[PDB]
Design an enzyme around this catalytic site. Structure first.
Site, PDB file in Angstrom:
ATOM      1  N   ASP A 159       0.557 -13.362  55.563  1.00  0.00           N
ATOM      2  CA  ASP A 159       1.803 -14.063  55.746  1.00  0.00           C
ATOM      3  C   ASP A 159       2.594 -13.577  56.954  1.00  0.00           C
ATOM      4  O   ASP A 159       3.318 -12.566  56.892  1.00  0.00           O
ATOM      5  CB  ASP A 159       2.637 -13.937  54.483  1.00  0.00           C
ATOM      6  CG  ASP A 159       3.845 -14.793  54.516  1.00  0.00           C
ATOM      7  OD1 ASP A 159       4.082 -15.413  55.575  1.00  0.00           O
ATOM      8  OD2 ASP A 159       4.574 -14.816  53.506  1.00  0.00           O
ATOM      9  N   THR A 160       2.426 -14.265  58.082  1.00  0.00           N
ATOM     10  CA  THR A 160       3.082 -13.854  59.319  1.00  0.00           C
ATOM     11  C   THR A 160       4.589 -14.048  59.286  1.00  0.00           C
ATOM     12  O   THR A 160       5.298 -13.451  60.093  1.00  0.00           O
ATOM     13  CB  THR A 160       2.516 -14.589  60.545  1.00  0.00           C
ATOM     14  OG1 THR A 160       2.689 -16.003  60.390  1.00  0.00           O
ATOM     15  CG2 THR A 160       1.044 -14.263  60.736  1.00  0.00           C
ATOM     16  N   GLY A 161       5.083 -14.826  58.327  1.00  0.00           N
ATOM     17  CA  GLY A 161       6.514 -15.010  58.150  1.00  0.00           C
ATOM     18  C   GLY A 161       7.174 -13.939  57.302  1.00  0.00           C
ATOM     19  O   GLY A 161       8.391 -13.967  57.105  1.00  0.00           O
TER      20      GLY A 161
HETATM   21  C1  LIG Z   1       5.563 -26.341  49.206  1.00  0.00           C
HETATM   22  N1  LIG Z   1       5.617 -26.175  50.666  1.00  0.00           N
HETATM   23  C2  LIG Z   1       6.348 -25.168  51.139  1.00  0.00           C
HETATM   24  N2  LIG Z   1       6.559 -24.965  52.436  1.00  0.00           N
HETATM   25  C3  LIG Z   1       7.196 -23.793  52.559  1.00  0.00           C
HETATM   26  C4  LIG Z   1       7.741 -23.192  53.622  1.00  0.00           C
HETATM   27  C5  LIG Z   1       8.295 -21.923  53.499  1.00  0.00           C
HETATM   28  C6  LIG Z   1       8.314 -21.327  52.245  1.00  0.00           C
HETATM   29  S1  LIG Z   1       8.884 -19.683  52.031  1.00  0.00           S
HETATM   30  O1  LIG Z   1       9.894 -19.367  53.113  1.00  0.00           O
HETATM   31  O2  LIG Z   1       9.461 -19.529  50.636  1.00  0.00           O
HETATM   32  N3  LIG Z   1       7.662 -18.590  52.175  1.00  0.00           N
HETATM   33  C7  LIG Z   1       6.552 -18.794  51.227  1.00  0.00           C
HETATM   34  C8  LIG Z   1       5.867 -17.461  50.887  1.00  0.00           C
HETATM   35  C9  LIG Z   1       6.923 -16.423  50.477  1.00  0.00           C
HETATM   36  C10 LIG Z   1       4.900 -17.664  49.716  1.00  0.00           C
HETATM   37  C11 LIG Z   1       7.222 -18.398  53.565  1.00  0.00           C
HETATM   38  C12 LIG Z   1       7.397 -16.928  53.951  1.00  0.00           C
HETATM   39  O3  LIG Z   1       6.692 -16.604  55.162  1.00  0.00           O
HETATM   40  C13 LIG Z   1       8.879 -16.543  54.071  1.00  0.00           C
HETATM   41  C14 LIG Z   1       9.554 -17.226  55.272  1.00  0.00           C
HETATM   42  C15 LIG Z   1      10.895 -16.792  55.358  1.00  0.00           C
HETATM   43  C16 LIG Z   1      11.320 -16.017  56.437  1.00  0.00           C
HETATM   44  C17 LIG Z   1      12.669 -15.697  56.571  1.00  0.00           C
HETATM   45  C18 LIG Z   1      13.567 -15.991  55.550  1.00  0.00           C
HETATM   46  C19 LIG Z   1      13.152 -16.768  54.474  1.00  0.00           C
HETATM   47  C20 LIG Z   1      11.829 -17.205  54.409  1.00  0.00           C
HETATM   48  N4  LIG Z   1       8.967 -15.093  54.240  1.00  0.00           N
HETATM   49  C21 LIG Z   1       9.600 -14.274  53.404  1.00  0.00           C
HETATM   50  O4  LIG Z   1      10.049 -14.648  52.310  1.00  0.00           O
HETATM   51  O5  LIG Z   1       9.679 -12.990  53.813  1.00  0.00           O
HETATM   52  C22 LIG Z   1      10.378 -12.080  52.982  1.00  0.00           C
HETATM   53  C23 LIG Z   1       9.474 -10.880  52.833  1.00  0.00           C
HETATM   54  O6  LIG Z   1       9.573 -10.180  54.110  1.00  0.00           O
HETATM   55  C24 LIG Z   1      10.894 -10.422  54.656  1.00  0.00           C
HETATM   56  O7  LIG Z   1      10.759 -10.992  55.991  1.00  0.00           O
HETATM   57  C25 LIG Z   1      11.306 -12.327  55.997  1.00  0.00           C
HETATM   58  C26 LIG Z   1      12.154 -12.484  54.745  1.00  0.00           C
HETATM   59  O8  LIG Z   1      13.503 -12.113  55.033  1.00  0.00           O
HETATM   60  C27 LIG Z   1      13.555 -10.952  55.863  1.00  0.00           C
HETATM   61  C28 LIG Z   1      14.830 -11.006  56.709  1.00  0.00           C
HETATM   62  O9  LIG Z   1      15.965 -11.217  55.860  1.00  0.00           O
HETATM   63  C29 LIG Z   1      15.845 -12.446  55.131  1.00  0.00           C
HETATM   64  C30 LIG Z   1      11.548 -11.482  53.767  1.00  0.00           C
HETATM   65  C31 LIG Z   1       7.788 -22.023  51.169  1.00  0.00           C
HETATM   66  C32 LIG Z   1       7.245 -23.224  51.346  1.00  0.00           C
HETATM   67  O10 LIG Z   1       6.666 -24.077  50.468  1.00  0.00           O
END
Ligand SMILES: C/N=c1/[nH]c2ccc(S(=O)(=O)N(CC(C)C)C[C@@H](O)[C@H](Cc3ccccc3)NC(=O)O[C@H]3CO[C@H]4OC[C@H](OCCOC)[C@H]43)cc2o1
Ligand SMILES: [Cl-]
Ligand SMILES: [Cl-]
Ligand SMILES: [Cl-]
EC number: 3.4.23.16
Lengths: 99, 99
Positions: free
Chosen positions: A25-27
């Site tokens: 998960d690059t996000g």
């Molecule tokens: C059905 N279709 C869809 N499409 C769709 C599209 C997206 C999402 S999703 O976003 O729920 N997500 C799903 C995944 C978790 C399974 C994607 C994920 O990569 C999120 C993205 C994100 C990044 C930043 C902020 C919020 C979300 N990352 C994330 O949660 O990271 C957390 C853990 O590490 C930290 O780094 C970032 C965050 O906050 C850290 C800084 O302060 C916030 C913290 C679900 C979706 O369902």
């Protein structure tokens, strides 16, 4: 390997003597796993994503193996709906995005 | 390009004539952007992540440029903490994970 993105990029990890499935998960800044036991010190943390925050336990310096690739890093444990491998560990296995 | 993961993989996108920053996110099935205006009719969708669910507006067949690469596809708009480019559009621009 080259991992396609037509499907979710799921892999098997080895951690704390257990095998688990997790999303590359690059996000995600951090690696977050569903409830499990890990050894050593931990401290509470809030992490936020789509939908808001959850409380997790932060364990540092945890060995993990992903695709034969050993690494060490921080693992967050708590009520995530799915196991994610975040950048903190993806860097260590030399994972890049390419296009 | 080849993008390492020591920092967030933030890129510039263009949508509706405007530049925005977004995160290349292999953990997201779908692309979700912060509140904005798009043309045409929308349909309802609920999407889930770390902290629960949000309701979004789904727009189909929207032109969007990602790091200069042209795509046309589904964009969700709602109260996401950050703009994320998910696999629906990462596959359009030929993105893979490699290690
Ligand atoms: C059905 N279709 C869809 N499409 C769709 C599209 C997206 C999402 S999703 O976003 O729920 N997500 C799903 C995944 C978790 C399974 C994607 C994920 O990569 C999120 C993205 C994100 C990044 C930043 C902020 C919020 C979300 N990352 C994330 O949660 O990271 C957390 C853990 O590490 C930290 O780094 C970032 C965050 O906050 C850290 C800084 O302060 C916030 C913290 C679900 C979706 O369902
Ligand atoms: Cl770490
Ligand atoms: Cl590197
Ligand atoms: Cl699409």
């Amino acid at each position: 390997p080259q991992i396609t993105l037509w499907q979710r990029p799921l892999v098997t990890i080895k951690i704390g003597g257990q095998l688990k499935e997790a999303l590359l998960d690059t996000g995600a800044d951090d690696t977050v796993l569903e409830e499990m036991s890990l050894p050593g010190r931990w401290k509470p943390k809030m992490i936020g994503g789509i939908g808001g925050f959850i409380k997790v336990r932060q364990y540092d310096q945890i060995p993990i193996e992903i695709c034969g690739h050993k690494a060490i890093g921080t693992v967050l444990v708590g009520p995530t709906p799915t196991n994610v491998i975040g950048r903190n560990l993806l860097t260590q296995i030399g994972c890049t995005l390419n296009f």
